[PDB]
Write a protein that binds this DNA or RNA. Structure first.
Ligand SMILES: [K+]
Ligand SMILES: [Mg+2]
Length: 228
RNA sequence: GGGGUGAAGGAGGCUUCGGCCGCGAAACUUCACCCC
């Protein structure tokens, strides 16, 4: 059998022919999350873009109102007073160009890296081959480079997410935990969607949000009307 | 229905209760792009 009984029971709960409203979906997610941990709620969308064109890629960040209920270890590389600013914002580890070494040597305990523009020359050359493969290399497009380092760190710690379409034109993002109250999930889902529409490429043709779905880490999906 | 590839989620998944699979890119699940 392709699925286990846990999952098969979940199938009973969803109507593949129904296009749910965000709120309907938000209430149903608690029931589609039966794995043995607090699953993450996800949103997926097929976009009306040509992923082959640089000017039609959809990429950006969005601060979810109620976060992801998750822990995120932030590493910040800064210069001068921004070192203080980064520590006072809560960065788990704050350093100067001298920390690139620790990582170069072994240190790999962090989930995100941010940097000020004035250390990017070093970060780029000395770390692109480590962080880059992992998609952790600081970059303006990922909102992880800036002189407003404290602000970036605060946003990330508070649950800001990144989104970038894949090469097939589909895009995906975590938007909360299945333990979230429905109302809060609805708020997060809507924020992600507005963020998405805010990134529709100027040249994209046809319907932007061709299809949108909500699901959980281990359960089935529910199609939704993004504008509900 | 059987599968591949991508991205995302993910620390657990399945079970005939013996164990099998995963915590490596890799289980499992989701949307896509494809093969049959
Ligand atoms: K999933
Ligand atoms: Mg993968």
């Amino acid at each position: 059998p392709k699925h286990g009984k846990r999952y098969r029971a979940l199938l009973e709960k969803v109507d593949p022919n129904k296009i749910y409203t965000i709120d309907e979906a938000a209430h149903l997610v608690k029931e589609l999350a039966t794995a043995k941990f607090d699953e993450t709620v996800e949103v997926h969308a097929k976009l009306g873009i040509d992923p082959r064109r640089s000017d039609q890629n959809v990429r950006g960040t969005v601060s979810l109102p109620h976060g992801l209920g998750k822990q995120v270890r932030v590493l910040a590389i800064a210069k001068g007073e921004k070192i203080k600013e980064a520590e006072e914002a809560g960065a788990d580890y704050v350093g100067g160009e001298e920390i690139i070494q620790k990582i170069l040597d072994g240190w790999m305990d962090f989930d995100a890296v941010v940097a000020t523009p004035d250390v990017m020359g070093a970060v780029g050359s000395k770390m692109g081959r480590i962080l880059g493969p992992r998609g952790l290399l600081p970059n303006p497009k990922a909102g992880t480079v800036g002189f407003n380092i404290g602000e970036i760190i605060r946003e990330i710690k508070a649950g800001r997410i990144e989104f970038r379409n894949d090469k097939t034109g589909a895009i995906h993002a975590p938007v909360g935990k299945a333990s979230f109250p429905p109302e809060k999930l609805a708020d997060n889902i809507r924020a992600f969607i507005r963020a998405l529409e805010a990134h529709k490429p100027e040249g994209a043709k046809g319907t932007f949000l061709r299809s949108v779905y909500v699901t959980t880490t281990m359960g089935p999906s529910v199609r939704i009307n993004p504008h509900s």
